[PDB]
Amino acid sequence: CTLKSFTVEKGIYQTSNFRVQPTESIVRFPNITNLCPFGEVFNATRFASV
Amino acid sequence: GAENSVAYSNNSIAIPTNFTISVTTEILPVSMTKTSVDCTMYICGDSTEC
Ligand SMILES: *[C@@H]1O[C@H](CO)[C@@H](O[C@@H]2O[C@H](CO)[C@@H](O)[C@H](O)[C@H]2NC(C)=O)[C@H](O)[C@H]1NC(C)=O
Ligand SMILES: *[C@@H]1O[C@H](CO)[C@@H](O)[C@H](O)[C@H]1NC(C)=O
């Protein structure tokens, strides 16, 4: 397929790279659980001027 | 270099009377390191999209 022919003659060819597939993907984060100051920013009316 | 003139004449010959057998090294490269790089992993890196 890579040599692009149906008859390969004698010799050592190179096909591709190989690698070990990823197994058991892991995700990590900090432990704190405190919703950030969302309401203090939007649910207010006295927004300053530009 | 050490500037000097030869005692040339039309009836004079200078003949050696001794010899020194010397040994001289000489160094030549013959080969480079057989390197090889891979398209699909260098350019992209374990990524189907790229
Ligand atoms: C030609 O040159 C050689 C160079 O070695 C001379 O040999 C030396 O001779 C002296 C005295 O004759 C010795 O003390 C050295 O030990 C010799 N060298 C070696 C390496 O053995 C030789 O004598 C010269 N030719 C003539 C006719 O004098
Ligand atoms: C802001 O107030 C509205 C009132 O309807 C509420 O629906 C919304 O969840 C509030 N959001 C925040 C971040 O306080």
UniProtKB/Swiss-Prot annotation, chain A:
Q: Where are the annotated glycans?
A: T23, S25, N31, N43
Q: What is the effect of changing N31Q?
A: Reduced viral infectivity
Q: What is the effect of changing R46K?
A: In strain: Mu/B.1.621
Q: Where is this region: Disordered?
A: 19-35
Swapping G39H leads to an effect described as: In strain: Omicron/BA.2.75, Omicron/XBB.1.5, Omicron/EG.5.1
Known consequence of changing N43Q?
Reduced viral infectivity
- Per its database record, what is this protein's job? Attaches the virion to the cell membrane by interacting with host receptor, initiating the infection. The major receptor is host ACE2. When S2/S2' has been cleaved, binding to the receptor triggers direct fusion at the cell membrane. When S2/S2' has not been cleaved, binding to the receptor results in internalization of the virus by endocytosis using host TFRC and GRM2 and leading to fusion of the virion membrane with the host endosomal membrane. Alternatively, may use NRP1/NRP2 and integrin as entry receptors.
Give the record's subunit note: Binds to host ACE2. RBD also interacts with the N-linked glycan on 'Asn-90' of ACE2. Cleavage of S generates a polybasic C-terminal sequence on S1 that binds to host Neuropilin-1 (NRP1) and Neuropilin-2 (NRP2) receptors. Interacts with host integrin alpha-5/beta-1 (ITGA5:ITGB1) and with ACE2 in complex with integrin alpha-5/beta-1 (ITGA5:ITGB1). May interact via cytoplasmic c-terminus with M protein. May interact (via N-terminus) with host bilirubin and biliverdin, thereby preventing antibody binding to the SARS-CoV-2 spike NTD via an allosteric mechanism.
Q: What is this protein called?
A: Spike protein S1
Organism, as annotated: Severe acute respiratory syndrome coronavirus 2 (2019-nCoV)
- Report where the shown chain sits in the full-length sequence: first residue, last residue, total length: 301 to 350 of 1273
UniProtKB/Swiss-Prot annotation, chain B:
What highest taxon heads this organism's lineage?
A: Viruses
Intrachain disulfide bonds:
C44-C50
Q: Which residues are glycosylated?
A: N10, N18
According to its UniProt entry, what is the function of this protein? Precursor of the fusion protein processed in the biosynthesis of the S protein and the formation of virus particle. Mediates fusion of the virion and cellular membranes by functioning as a class I viral fusion protein. Contains two viral fusion peptides that are unmasked after cleavage. The S2/S2' cleavage occurs during virus entry at the cell membrane by host TMPRSS2 or during endocytosis by host CSTL.
Name of the protein in its database record: Spike protein S2
Q: Which organism is it from?
A: Severe acute respiratory syndrome coronavirus 2 (2019-nCoV)
**Gene this protein is translated from:** S
